[PDB]
Design a protein around this ligand. Structure first.
Ligand SMILES: [Cu+2]
Ligand SMILES: [Cu+2]
Ligand SMILES: [Cu+2]
Ligand SMILES: [Cu+2]
Length: 461
């Protein structure tokens, strides 16, 4: 059982001068918002048609005035979007905002740079963009967020993000907690400050990554979950601009991680804490069968109360998973397997990828399709006052080899698309790109990304 946070304590977010801790949001406690699933516009057998509109609205978060928020098909965040492996999807992307945006599917394997929804894929105000893809990757917790250069940090701050679920035959075979909103929860973790009961990104802006005073979970404050059934699935996503989340129950109740960014783990991992850098997902099961019907269990990040689990008339149930949990195909790495070294350096405004800022017309690397590649990703920052950069690659899922030549963390034997790189650390990963086109890689601290800590790979035959 993992009893440690698996990232270097020396480099955590709370060591920075100008680090602002979470504080209690005012008003009554609310039941956790669970977004309803996006309904298909039309289903011609095996082909599904979705419409996703970026739009401004008003959300009751704090008591008093409603907050002016941006959302997808709603006032804030978006609906749950279900994809199935094998199915083909025709998505209409509509921009009903008064500025340019983009529709990036973080963790989806699709052609770039237009289908992918990078900064080369603008949708102009009152504009329409139709895309077509076939989902061909395992069941995973994925997400959609705007990705225009360099307005990404602000557009996510204003509320544009949506949890996305890929499901497959195998994941359904496990018979996990499936009752959406009772058994099975999306937990989108965000942090926002309010003045006038309103968002103001310019006011709160930090170059080194913007922090919020109040914890936003699925766009609700002071969230509560009423445990009907004892075994509950929590699909954690760190949707924050910069803030790391060090999740644990107040009494360090154990829980089981079953999923990473790119699908189910090969084996279930028991633990009593977990740390998520930006854009990382953790799929965990919690057995509340342990507690009595009248009790209250509080989920915390550090010493801050995040979400209260009010246990109701619960019936005893033993939580048993298979070993192995899932079969992950190993990528074959031989002696003539090409290596590519990328160096994350600098902090605040001095942040660089291989010493360069992002240019939309410059291709930084070129790699071959369907041939597995090794990547040495290095964080050059000083272990003294350094920073954990969450490194992400578009249009793929990769496997870890080592962290500084040593063994990989217990929750990284599966598929990932973003990894936290500690100061003075070089991570070894192997990746086989399946789709042709131009793809981006960058730090997933949205202010570092906006500054230009981003580069482009072309994939060719
Ligand atoms: Cu992303
Ligand atoms: Cu992405
Ligand atoms: Cu960074
Ligand atoms: Cu990106």
């Amino acid at each position: 059982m993992i009893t440690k946070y698996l990232y270097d304590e020396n480099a955590y977010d709370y060591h920075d001068g100008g680090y602002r801790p979470l504080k209690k949001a005012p008003g009554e406690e609310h039941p956790l918002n669970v977004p309803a699933f996006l309904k298909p516009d039309r289903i011609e057998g095996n082909e599904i048609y979705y419409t996703v509109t970026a739009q401004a609205g008003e959300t009751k978060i704090l008591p008093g005035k409603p907050t002016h928020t941006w959302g997808y098909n709603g006032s804030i965040l978006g609906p749950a979007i279900q994809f199935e492996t094998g199915k083909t999807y025709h998505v209409t992307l509509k921009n009903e905002l008064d500025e340019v945006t983009t529709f990036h599917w973080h963790g989806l394997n699709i052609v770039g740079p237009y289908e992918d929804g990078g900064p080369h894929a603008p949708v102009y105000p009152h504009g329409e963009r139709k895309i077509t893809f076939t989902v061909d990757q395992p069941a995973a917790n994925i997400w959609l967020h705007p990705h225009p250069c360099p307005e990404t940090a602000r557009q996510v701050w204003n509320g544009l993000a949506a949890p996305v679920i890929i499901t497959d035959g195998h994941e359904q075979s496990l018979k996990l907690p499936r009752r959406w909103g009772v058994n099975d929860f999306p937990v989108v973790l965000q942090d926002r400050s309010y003045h006038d009961n309103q968002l103001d990104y310019k006011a709160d802006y930090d170059v080194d990554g913007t922090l919020g005073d109040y914890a936003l979970v699925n766009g609700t404050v002071n969230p509560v979950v009423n445990v009907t059934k004892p075994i509950i699935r929590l699909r954690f996503l760190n949707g924050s601009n910069r803030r790391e989340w060090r999740l644990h129950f107040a009494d360090y109740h154990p829980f089981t991680q079953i999923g990473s960014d790119g699908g189910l783990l090969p084996e279930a991992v028991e633990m009593d804490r977990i740390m998520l850098t930006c854009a990382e997902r953790a799929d965990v099961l919690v057995n509340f069968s342990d507690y009595q019907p009248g009790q209250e269990v509080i989920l915390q990040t550090d010493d801050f109360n995040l979400i209260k689990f009010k246990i109701g008339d619960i019936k005893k149930e033993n939580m048993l998973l298979p070993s192995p949990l899932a079969e992950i195909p190993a990528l074959s790495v031989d002696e003539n397997t090409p290596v590519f070294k990328t160096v994350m350096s600098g902090m605040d405004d001095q942040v660089r990828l291989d010493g360069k800022l992002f240019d939309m017309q410059r291709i930084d690397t070129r790699q071959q399709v369907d041939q597995t590649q090794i990547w040495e990703v290095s964080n050059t920052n000083d272990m003294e006052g350094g920073m954990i950069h969450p490194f992400h690659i578009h249009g793929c899922q990769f496997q870890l080899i080592d962290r500084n030549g040593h063994a990989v963390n217990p929750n990284e034997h599966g598929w990932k698309d973003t990894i936290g790189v500690n100061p003075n650390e070089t991570v070894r990963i192997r990746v086989k790109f399946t789709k042709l086109g131009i793809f981006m890689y960058h730090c997933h601290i949205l202010e570092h990304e906006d500054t230009g800590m981003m580069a482009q790979i072309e994939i060719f035959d």
